[PDB]
Write a protein that binds this ligand. Structure first.
Ligand code: NA
Lengths: 420, 210
């Protein structure tokens, strides 16, 4: 039940505790930062404030101001009028309180508090320079093949999914790109439930009994169209369990001249089915790469009801760090509010949540101990428009708060998949 | 500048499909060089006369959250009755809708107008899946008001008795609408969870004849 492993390696939840338990509070108003001390006895005499402004990851300004705050007191810090941003994007402000001198309990340079705000945002209005290339639609009884130069997209007409992609003669997928509404159950999803003594109120059991894990996709529609400068693929699927429709998924794929695939997804969720664990897509990628790069919340694991500690910046970690090694394996390694993701030859743009690793949701839920896991061929990807909270007020009864349950009935998300 | 903002056209293309015609548009609302709103739409007209409209709006994070995200027009038709499947039968808003019930409702046009002595936005009905007026039918998941008075007349006139009915019927169909508040009437009182602050909004509508 610990915040740390038995060998004292931190769980991701330790960072969330550090941030919420901070001793300095911050408000922003125009160009003024207000800092409040929550110390009862000491002055801030080993503290200074580092601030920085970045446009979509790229720094534009930074600076330092010594902190001089009495117990329970306030200090007003006025930012210099900041250089105007050139292009489009959202400006972000980050502050951190740094301890310059070593103590009996910390190293010099130790970070004790932090906070972020959105500043000015300029929206992209200018039409991206209209390219000339034009994608080529090839139709057979079993498939739709889209070709742009030497890039190839294959849609299966029987199953209704993007079943393979090609750059030249190099294939990208080991498993087709499909919808996903399930996660490998966390301890909070399971609670005190067991094979010998089932607890029907637990999230895992409501999910099992409704047939979420056994749901079979059934194609409703699958059409292909040529436009002026692109090809459009329209699909619709029903997920059913023994006659009862659980979810309907409606998608458009738009592949244009610049070689980008715009995916638009619209999902309906039956009001009387237990709210699903996630609403997204998954596939098994052929490529295994070293690093993972993203513009979003990080660097550590973060979930919708546990993402306050994470900051919005540009992050770059090795693949093995995007997986959290819980002793009892479960869904893990998510990062939220991501605008861009980069892995090997692939780039994904939008506003989504993701995890990425060598283990599939199926392997994670079938294995009881972490040492028993084996890396699978390629890399398993999950990209969710929406993901249920993880809870934790206790681990023996539903604890996910109402504002974190996927309960809206109708959902929308869009992604762009291209090459970097 | 929300009231003074002018729609600038970014894109407007047409494509013929196997069974339909698809119109794509994009607009940007600006004031003194700042982009407030961007609206991206597709209209799809299929073989059965139905028009499917898809809208995606971006709102600038540093502009004050908008009062509504929707569409308007002035219809030529003046009909006796309004018929809808949604919350009703009385006026209801996102932070004042619990009393309303979901069902099929049917009222004379004049009932779709609340005669507040000082005139303002009035008459909204929320959580609607279907609206009927004359030979028109709208389907989706939206909020609406319908009346003989433009938002503009309503905002320029000070006493209800000084209002005059306009030719035809003004229709407002919103994907989203800001709460009304009222914990008091002398400071901002709309609670955070009823402000339109998500930055990106999506809604869809089918328009047909019946
Ligand atoms: Na008025």
């Amino acid at each position: 039940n610990g915040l740390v492993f038995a060998d004292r390696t931190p769980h991701p939840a330790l960072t969330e505790a550090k941030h919420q338990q901070q001793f300095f509070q911050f408000r922003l108003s125009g160009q003024t930062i207000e800092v409040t001390s929550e110390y009862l006895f000491r002055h801030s005499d080993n503290e200074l404030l580092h601030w920085m402004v970045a446009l979509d990851g790229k720094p534009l300004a930074s600076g330092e101001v010594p902190l001089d705050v009495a117990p329970q007191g306030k200090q007003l810090i006025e930012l210099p009028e900041l250089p105007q941003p050139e292009s489009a994007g959202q400006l972000w402000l980050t502050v951190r309180v740094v301890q310059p001198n070593a103590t009996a309990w910390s190293e010099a340079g130790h970070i004790s508090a932090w906070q972020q705000w959105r500043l000015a945002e300029n929206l992209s209005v200018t039409l991206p320079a209209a390219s000339h290339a034009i994608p080529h639609l090839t139709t057979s009884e079993m498939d739709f093949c889209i070709e742009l130069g030497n890039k190839r997209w294959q849609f299966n007409r029987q199953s209704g999914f993007l079943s393979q992609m090609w750059i030249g003669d190099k294939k990208q997928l080991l498993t087709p790109l499909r919808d996903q509404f399930t996660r490998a159950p966390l301890d909070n999803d399971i609670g005190v439930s067991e094979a010998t003594r089932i607890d029907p109120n637990a999230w895992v059991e409501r999910w099992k009994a409704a047939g979420h894990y056994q749901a079979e996709a059934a194609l409703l529609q699958c059409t292909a169209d040529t436009l002026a400068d692109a090809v459009l693929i329209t699909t619709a699927h029903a997920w059913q369990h023994q006659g009862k429709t659980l979810f309907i998924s409606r998608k458009t794929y738009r592949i244009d001249g610049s070689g980008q695939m715009a995916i638009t997804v619209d999902v309906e969720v039956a009001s009387d089915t237990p709210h699903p664990a996630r609403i997204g897509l998954n596939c098994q990628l052929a490529q295994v790469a070293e690093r993972v790069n993203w513009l979003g919340l990080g660097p550590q694991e973060n979930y919708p009801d546990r993402l306050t500690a994470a900051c919005f910046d540009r992050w770059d970690l090795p693949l093995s760090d995007m997986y959290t090694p819980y002793v009892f394996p479960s869904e893990n390694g998510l990062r939220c509010g991501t605008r861009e993701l980069n892995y090997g030859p692939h780039q994904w743009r939008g506003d989504f949540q993701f995890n990425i690793s060598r283990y599939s949701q199926q392997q994670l839920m079938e294995t009881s101990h972490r040492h028993l896991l084996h890396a699978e061929e390629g890399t398993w990807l999950n990209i969710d428009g929406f993901h249920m909270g993880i809870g934790g007020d206790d681990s023996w009864s539903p604890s996910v708060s109402a504002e974190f349950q996927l309960s809206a009935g109708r959902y929308h998300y869009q992604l762009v998949w291209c090459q970097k």
